[PDB]
């Protein structure tokens, strides 16, 4: 290791781990995706009727991050479940379900108990893990190794974005026979090529993320607001800032703001809004104005080329542009960096 | 409001009557049957559907979370509960054999209404659970249930939430009325529904105890409300109540997700309310209480009044009467409704 913290290293490693996940799998010449661990099951999975993503903590947030593109490209119901809640409810599961179990370690008890429950119902089980030979990796019918390398830190960082990328790769396989989605998977794979270079462009803003931490050093709460593709971003951002900085960070769905949580907004409540260039732009802007009109001052994580938000907002963490279903990868990096720097400022052991 | 200053307070205290009104002409406690006459032109088709989708905003979404489990149990169907804004953002796949419920006090909430029109275009059977006769959601659905809570004049939903809760329970009871193996389960639930109004009066009797808890808490900036299973909705709804009218930074936390990051926020200084009721998640909840006290947290525990071990081993507890596990969520949310109110009065705001 070269850096101070394991977490810190693992964060800056992301332009390399992403490439490792796509290694011997993606091909940018002939637009083919191929996930070896699923090559014996991919046709049976393609005939299934629902996808269930079961996980705890940040591995659950990755499901949330890729729910939408999975629905769009499989045209199947996609259900994302927190493993503890899944087991408490005795969730209905059937033989034509494909159940995914996302777990970095492959040993989290609830996610594994969920695997056994699903297997007993006769569902097709799929592992998205980072630990070869782990319990979740062995006991599932098939699976994918995200290949992000070892993770020794307490907060997941590279594991999250590589869980992300692999689920997007799975989505690209599922829709490979459909004529109408040929262009759509082209633009997604172009973005997967540009991804590591653009992740490095985000790592360039460590300066601005370091000094944003010092302003929020004394603060006790921070509301992270996000829509659609970035609901996961805000949930995951809020979870890091909880876990390692011990500040009350809560992710809030932007569309739910007017239904109650808006009350929390005043001049003294710091807000981080994720307003990016996708189909929900106008609605994210309505959420901004609702916050401003309540006298809040939001640090907006926005697009680099979004002129009417860079000038119109005091603090902006400008992020490079990618295709809508990949932006979640880029826009979460500033928040995992902010979680690290606040932890340092308060004099805590990130590891 | 006869004696009350607040509409919200009046409406919370109205809940022993509004629950009766919700069940009037639907639950028969003389022969223990359930019928929702607003559905009878579609009930055959609904009974043959292959998935329920609940679509709503805010506390109406919470009413969905609060009833997801008994709906899965009694229907044996997948039940997916969706926040309406995010439902539209994703173009969620919907099919002709889906039954889509639209939970809305007002019956006009824009996202919930657009979710309705989206589901119709795809051929799903649509059902309105509203508190407003002749509203858009009531008119545009194929069938409906009016929850009969009465006008809600407060800004925060109280009686409507719990009426929506009972409504969805009634629907669940109806869906399993032909299963021999479930007759005792549903007789249990209906006995619970019949006792429920008096058990709310007993909860409302702790208005004093809840007042004095608010005096100890109202200076605080944050409070974590933790709970599991049936009471996950209780903690999300209580967290939204405390946000909406007190402006305190409350947040609902799934008890089973504590050990995955949120537990690091717990110490001597962070207020915590845990929900520990006598149901199948008891041991899992106690585990959650052990790791909160192990990190120096001194939580207020909402619990069963005859749970002698939680009452003795914790200083401040709110002692709630026991009912059926799938109804308990009605009793355990009320103290949080009242706390939100007394917490807000102490600070001094115009609750309505
Ligand atoms: O990493 C974090 C938070 O930074 C945890 O929330 C884990 O994501 C969770 O404990 C599941 O762990 P795995 O099941 O993925 O090993
Ligand atoms: O009352 C509250 C919170 O106490 C609101 O969150 C409403 O539940 C929401 O705005 C949806 O309203 P309806 O669609 O239920 O009318």
Short mmCIF file of C-alpha atoms in Angstrom, two decimals, chain B residues 203 230-231 234-235 275 277 302 320-321 327-337:
data_model
loop_
_atom_site.label_atom_id
_atom_site.label_comp_id
_atom_site.label_asym_id
_atom_site.label_seq_id
_atom_site.Cartn_x
_atom_site.Cartn_y
_atom_site.Cartn_z
CA UNK B 203 -52.65 3.46 24.44
CA UNK B 230 -44.10 -5.54 11.42
CA UNK B 231 -42.68 -2.47 13.20
CA UNK B 234 -43.86 1.98 12.68
CA UNK B 235 -40.30 3.38 12.87
CA UNK B 275 -39.61 -1.19 19.20
CA UNK B 277 -43.05 -6.37 20.72
CA UNK B 302 -41.67 0.66 23.11
CA UNK B 320 -48.10 -0.98 24.97
CA UNK B 321 -50.91 -3.54 25.27
CA UNK B 327 -52.21 -5.63 14.16
CA UNK B 328 -49.59 -4.57 16.76
CA UNK B 329 -48.19 -1.99 14.31
CA UNK B 330 -51.38 0.02 14.89
CA UNK B 331 -50.77 0.22 18.66
CA UNK B 332 -47.02 0.88 18.48
CA UNK B 333 -47.24 3.84 16.07
CA UNK B 334 -49.66 5.79 18.26
CA UNK B 335 -47.15 6.71 21.00
CA UNK B 336 -44.94 8.10 18.23
CA UNK B 337 -47.85 10.14 16.85
#
